Amino acid sequence: VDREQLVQKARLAEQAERYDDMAAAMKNVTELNEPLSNEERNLLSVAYKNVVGARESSWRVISSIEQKTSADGNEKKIEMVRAYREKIEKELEAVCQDVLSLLDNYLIKNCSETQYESKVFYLKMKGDYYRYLAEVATGEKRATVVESSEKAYSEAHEISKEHMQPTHPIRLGLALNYSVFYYEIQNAPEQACHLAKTAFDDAIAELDTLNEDSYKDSTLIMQLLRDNLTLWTSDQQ
């Protein structure tokens, strides 16, 4: 089928909530080796976020079951539960590795110098999916992915501060996800709060930089930021 039909299939899949199809569709689009439009970037992101999310949920439910099943001291049970959690875990990792391959070999790769917004978006995704891997990894595995995630967020932050308005939704999104990385993965609540706080303040200080096309996105992400600053200030107390 044609590119237009693959993107259309991706829209249909989203409606049916068949996110596996949605991701596979946007993967095939990306593999066309052509740049991605804003809509296509969104479809691909939404697609893989829901897939990895679905796995994450299942992974948590089973992992928790693996917790109380081992505490009880069962045997054949831990055998199956562990093997099932590993199956879901393997699936989750494979999904992340799938997007990551797309980002490194197509999206971040084919971007030119002048395309700073795209590079920030894609670098943020890269950080995101390395972050998701960290959530289920430990030891060498975790430290290595926590590292890659860090590297990706940082480089994206460098380009955001240097090329984008503090109110740009992509810059705010990066701040949101990056600050979440600090709090949830780095376990660095101060740094998490600071980044989120700093980001929110910057946008506020330059509230006049908003534009018709994405003012809703900016304000919303700003809300999400303030929400975390409030959700983190109570939990750390």
Partner: peptide
């Protein structure tokens, strides 16, 4: 209590 996050590019 997961914290809030986001990822939707401007379409």
């Amino acid at each position: 209590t997961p914290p809030v996050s986001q990822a939707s590019s401007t379409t």
